[PDB]
Design a protein around this nucleic acid. Sequence first.
RNA 1: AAGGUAAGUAU
RNA 2: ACUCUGGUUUCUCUUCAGAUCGCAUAAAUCUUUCGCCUUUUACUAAAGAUUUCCGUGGAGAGGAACAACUCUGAGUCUUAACCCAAUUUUUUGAGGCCUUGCUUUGGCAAGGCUA
Lengths: 49, 836
Amino acid sequence: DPEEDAPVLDWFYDHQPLRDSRKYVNGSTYQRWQFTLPMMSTLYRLANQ
Amino acid sequence: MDFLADLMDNSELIRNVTLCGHLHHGKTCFVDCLIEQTHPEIRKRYDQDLCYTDILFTEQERGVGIKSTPVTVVLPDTKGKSYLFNIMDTPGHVNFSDEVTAGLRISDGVVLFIDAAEGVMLNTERLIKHAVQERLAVTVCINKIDRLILELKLPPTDAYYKLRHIVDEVNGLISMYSTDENLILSPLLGNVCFSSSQYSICFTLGSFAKIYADTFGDINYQEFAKRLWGDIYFNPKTRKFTKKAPTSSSQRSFVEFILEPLYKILAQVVGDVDTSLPRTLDELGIHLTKEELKLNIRPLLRLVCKKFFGEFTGFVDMCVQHIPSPKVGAKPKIEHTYTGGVDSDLGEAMSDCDPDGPLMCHTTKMYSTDDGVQFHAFGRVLSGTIHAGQPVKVLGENYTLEDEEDSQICTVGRLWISVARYHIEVNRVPAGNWVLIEGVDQPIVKTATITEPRGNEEAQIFRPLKFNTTSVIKIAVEPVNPSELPKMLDGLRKVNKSYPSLTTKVEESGEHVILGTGELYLDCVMHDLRKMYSEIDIKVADPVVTFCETVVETSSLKCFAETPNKKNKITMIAEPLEKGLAEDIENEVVQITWNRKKLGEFFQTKYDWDLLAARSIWAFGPDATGPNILVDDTLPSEVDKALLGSVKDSIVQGFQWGTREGPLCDELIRNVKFKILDAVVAQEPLHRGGGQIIPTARRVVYSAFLMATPRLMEPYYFVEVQAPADCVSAVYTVLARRRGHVTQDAPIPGSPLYTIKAFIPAIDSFGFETDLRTHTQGQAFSLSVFHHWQIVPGDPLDKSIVIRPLEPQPAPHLAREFMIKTRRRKGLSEDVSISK
RNA sequence: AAGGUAAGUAU
RNA sequence: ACUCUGGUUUCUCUUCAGAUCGCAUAAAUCUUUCGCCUUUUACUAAAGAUUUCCGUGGAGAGGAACAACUCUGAGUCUUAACCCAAUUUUUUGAGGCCUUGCUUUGGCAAGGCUA
């Protein structure tokens, strides 16, 4: 849903999401991730099952 | 630590504090916060909770405080004046109340920790009653206030309502237990702290007003603290506080100025760390580095609260303004605990608490070394200064002015100031302090009193600890290899030393017995006895409670007994006591030291006893406070009182022995009144010696008890269960199978959890907590404590009852089976003939 | 998967 | 609001790994107990000790890319309108005289006198 899934909608269902976003990952090595609370809450709601 | 050593010499800058409360209420975490305050290199891990006082591996693995851990730190107050705090971290589990009692003896004040989410739990009430009865200052520290915000999600008004309800309930409990009016506890008086030991929150009204004063300025924080509580609304128009709300939606001063900022601080971090958190931190004057803003939500909350609240000063203000110093509190301490009292020359000397004077150190705890070979006594120095290498006279617990045999001369080894994981090796310790003493292990069992080897003969001992609960659970222990019995005996004496309430005794059948308070207590005792100390394999019998014996009717025959020389005859009968009389005698409501006039007046007024019978009371119970009465009902016109009184001590001793070891089993006799009807006493003093009267008195006591209809009394536990609404039915189902009936199931105000109060037999309570937690998926947690003795159903002496080998018996068959199997385990005869 | 090869001489 | 501080990413290499190397989890070998037993190769399942493998962290070194862009910390973190003093210093009524003791003399010590 574009309303409630907005924090993750753009980069969800992507191979190695946010791999190029230096704000959310260390780099192309894809070792560390720093996520905002809205994205964490959206992911937590998407994985209730 | 030189300043710490110099602070010991000033008794006015010393606080002896005992941290007490229910299980898992944040006491240990609070001490961890204090240590983190004082020790920069000791920092709690981000996820794993630091447990600095929990030094035992059993405590670390179980996650439950087991033994008291002393902590001596230098804690500055609000005004920056450093003090010396002796802090006892007493375990909160109800089965380990012995450690709490040991801590309360060497302490002057009490800081009571209460969970904010939970109400006033069972151990909270029990420790309130104990601290009040021990004559200690009571201060409340409502901990885990973060729960009301991040967990219960209550509005700030409802959080204030919950805190106010907790304070009101504590005040009601204190008023019920005590009589002093000045024992009212309120944050306005400075008696209450609101804290969150997980996130390093700790403040009173004074300290938080001090935060305002340091931020805004031109504010009298002492005067501002007197407005930050109660229904004292704040009027922004007049800038003054009024008892009437200026507006319809006006909040309390506490809510508006304290709870609202706390909610906003704890809500801009857990939800808005990403945006608007740096703005809030700038508004609060808090600056965090780039690598500190990357921490997870919980470490970030801890760091933000450490920056905003800084050091722990509200707690120090509470313990300085309300907990008396050793010099101030010495006089009530000596009046309560010392046997001689404050009237004695030493009693006057103790109240001065002079560092130079007659050394009198009272030790209530004993801590074992790493190898377990040596024990270090721990206690308060109530007068004089102890030194390393100094010989001392180590009084025991049976030591009196007459015998002087329980004492022993020992050389004090190294001395330490104990702070949990490390100890400061000192050379001397002045009065009013807590010290670890080595070289004193051997003569000390349980409590002890240490004095100078020579020059002090008036020195009596301190009264032994009066534990809040009775150890009724009994387990038998035997080594796997019988050749290793001495090692097991050494382990038994070691665990006796290391556990204040433990009672290790040997039955007539050679069975070694351990007395405990509950399943967890005896589990810890056995784990210690196996791993440390004995270091050998030990077999454990199935746990069995200890019973008591009573009479439900008066004896139908005038029982008589005669001495071996047949020159003395005693006629005695046994009848049940009045309801509530045994409880009053045990609770020290009436003492043997009372004059006969007041005793008779009490018995006539509160029990409708005849003046002739009330003034004829001879002795109480097996011991000074035993729940049995020996009444001399002999008519003076028939037997000479002066002749009868010549053997009064011997017959009293025989009565005490007979009530100690009952006829039915080797168990205490409870709630029985003995009347001496006829007592023919020989005139010559050789034929009326103790060795003749005492066995005759015991035999006549046995005969009087047996002829009167006897019954077995079993201990009943009181159980408080924290369960949700849907788990109450499971609690009912579990309690039904174990002869347990529920007296109360009331919802907890401010929480969705319920509290079910019930009485369960202590012999049906084995595995009760495990069953309750398994049947409720762990949502129902219960704590059991001994409450009262109850008569076992059935007739113990009914010989027609048939006992099946491995089958539970019905209700009528319970008493007979209990008596038979208790006699079998004790090693006595198969059954008790009424003739004997 | 094996413990289940006949040893040959001729073409 | 002053000045200096001087990165991040990526690819290799060399070593050290306590720590849940790993919030996950394989295999092989050996030695004991078994289970199948009839011999290999497979195994049964517990314990103990190894090795390999899939990965991991720190530090060091050498290349490349954005090398040019700024950080943090330290350094003293450096400014005038109108409004003010009975507890520590620009508004603060704290002055002088004399006595006698005493110092080699100067002076000092105490008391008295005020206005």
